[PDB]
Design an enzyme around this catalytic site. Structure first.
Site, PDB file in Angstrom:
ATOM      1  N   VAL A 140       2.517   3.881   2.377  1.00  0.00           N
ATOM      2  CA  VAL A 140       1.681   4.807   3.060  1.00  0.00           C
ATOM      3  C   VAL A 140       1.483   4.446   3.899  1.00  0.00           C
ATOM      4  O   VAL A 140       0.976   3.156   3.339  1.00  0.00           O
ATOM      5  CB  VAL A 140       0.866   6.323   2.088  1.00  0.00           C
ATOM      6  CG1 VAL A 140       0.138   5.353   1.482  1.00  0.00           C
ATOM      7  CG2 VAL A 140       0.980   6.768   3.370  1.00  0.00           C
ATOM      8  N   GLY A 157      -4.883   4.325   5.819  1.00  0.00           N
ATOM      9  CA  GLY A 157      -5.759   5.303   7.379  1.00  0.00           C
ATOM     10  C   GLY A 157      -6.899   4.064   7.813  1.00  0.00           C
ATOM     11  O   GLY A 157      -6.622   4.712   8.936  1.00  0.00           O
ATOM     12  N   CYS A 158      -7.179   3.433   7.136  1.00  0.00           N
ATOM     13  CA  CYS A 158      -8.570   2.712   7.242  1.00  0.00           C
ATOM     14  C   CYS A 158      -7.848   1.850   8.602  1.00  0.00           C
ATOM     15  O   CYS A 158      -8.700   2.252   9.834  1.00  0.00           O
ATOM     16  CB  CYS A 158      -9.020   1.356   6.263  1.00  0.00           C
ATOM     17  SG  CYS A 158      -7.435  -0.013   5.721  1.00  0.00           S
ATOM     18  N   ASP A 199      -8.510   1.261  12.507  1.00  0.00           N
ATOM     19  CA  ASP A 199      -9.863   0.744  12.993  1.00  0.00           C
ATOM     20  C   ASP A 199      -8.471   0.747  14.574  1.00  0.00           C
ATOM     21  O   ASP A 199      -9.052   0.046  15.198  1.00  0.00           O
ATOM     22  CB  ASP A 199      -8.826  -1.009  11.984  1.00  0.00           C
ATOM     23  CG  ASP A 199     -10.098  -2.222  12.688  1.00  0.00           C
ATOM     24  OD1 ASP A 199     -11.211  -2.203  12.527  1.00  0.00           O
ATOM     25  OD2 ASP A 199      -9.324  -3.140  13.168  1.00  0.00           O
ATOM     26  N   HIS A 243       0.711  -0.963  -0.460  1.00  0.00           N
ATOM     27  CA  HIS A 243      -0.665   0.084  -0.373  1.00  0.00           C
ATOM     28  C   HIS A 243       1.005   0.832  -0.139  1.00  0.00           C
ATOM     29  O   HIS A 243       0.933   1.479   0.883  1.00  0.00           O
ATOM     30  CB  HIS A 243      -0.475  -0.245   1.448  1.00  0.00           C
ATOM     31  CG  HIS A 243      -2.089   1.003   1.328  1.00  0.00           C
ATOM     32  ND1 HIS A 243      -3.566   0.254   1.305  1.00  0.00           N
ATOM     33  CD2 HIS A 243      -2.181   1.838   1.608  1.00  0.00           C
ATOM     34  CE1 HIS A 243      -4.306   1.398   1.680  1.00  0.00           C
ATOM     35  NE2 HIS A 243      -3.445   2.078   1.302  1.00  0.00           N
TER      36      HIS A 243
END
Ligand SMILES: */C(=C/C(=O)SCCNC(C)=O)CCCCCCC
Ligand SMILES: */C(=C/C(=O)SCCNC(C)=O)CCCCCCC
EC number: 4.2.1.59
Lengths: 171, 171
Positions: A76, A79-80, A84, A70
């Site tokens: 990077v 963001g997910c 979480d 990713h």
């Protein structure tokens, strides 16, 4: 459960196997879904609403699995995954208060990503400010969250919601 | 880009390598972060707001990586990954329209999880309805998303926001 103000990586790993809060308490995800290395502070009061606070950290190194996919050639942290971690901390806190049941994220209000976590960063900090806790027949937590990378705020999430459920047959 | 109404698993894998939309278009994450197996439909009109629509699928089987760690003894697909697949589709669509740059999720407005994805499910469907697309020299996409498991609506996300960036050294 006997409440401690902090927990080590070993404790978080024991948690994933249900060895921290017992068999009735919630479990944190295990690697590679575990998104924190330690919980540096946990309090019943404090935080922006004086109703509870949790601060945790994730050490960053270029070899973490997610940097490799990713994205390829543009690493990077997703963001997910930071998001979480915030749900994970809200659920962990509920178990810390003695809540029993399986953890399930219920949702979140606004989430804003204004910066990124690169493989050159060193530490990600998570701060959870509780605004409401329901610990009756139903166990549910509501909080706002902040994610900082090397002391700079990059993500905010309003109204993170998580509940613990003994029966998840209706989901 | 030579738009196709649908893309196969191999097309999504080429996308992750930067081959599908070329060196200047966005890339999808590569496994284990790629959260779809195929894109069944893409239309620039249509959708709830008649501004664009995309439908994708993820085939489910007990061996998917996340089932083994989230949680041990209580497998459930992380809700955060379903959210990422939706951000992934929004950015993929901006690249499909011809947008150039590296994809970065910017946020989401409201997310509600009313159901779960068990290892016994067969398929997850993602439906993305575009609300606003700014494809000027500032590429951003706003959309609402829905996740269904074997036809059952389980997650809704309002105002998913993704943008493509030439230079990301600013974040
Ligand atoms: C992993 C999985 C989910 O929560 S999937 C959410 C599905 N929601 C419903 C209502 O079924 C994330 C775990 C975060 C909470 C951990 C608590 C320890
Ligand atoms: C993977 C990583 C991120 O988007 S991290 C978000 C950081 N935000 C900013 C402002 O820097 C998810 C990629 C989803 C979009 C993919 C489009 C192809």
């Amino acid at each position: 459960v006997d409440k401690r103000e902090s927990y080590t990586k070993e404790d978080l790993l024991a948690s994933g196997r249900g060895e921290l809060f017992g068999a009735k308490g919630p479990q944190l995800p295990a690697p590679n879904m575990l998104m924190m290395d330690r919980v540096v502070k946990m309090t019943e009061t404090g935080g922006n609403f004086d109703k509870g606070y949790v601060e945790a950290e994730l050490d960053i190194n270029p070899d973490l699995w997610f940097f490799g996919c990713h994205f390829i050639g543009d690493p990077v942290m997703p963001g997910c995954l930071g998001l979480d971690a915030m749900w994970q901390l809200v659920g962990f806190y509920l178990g810390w208060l003695g809540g029993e049941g399986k953890g399930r994220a219920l949702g979140v209000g606004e989430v804003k990503f204004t910066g990124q976590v690169l493989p050159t960063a060193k530490k990600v900090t998570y701060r959870i400010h509780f605004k409401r806790i329901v610990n009756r027949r139903l166990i549910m937590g509501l909080a706002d969250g902040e994610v900082l990378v090397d002391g700079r705020l990059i993500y905010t999430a309003s109204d993170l919601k998580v509940g613990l459920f003994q029966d998840t047959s209706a989901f």
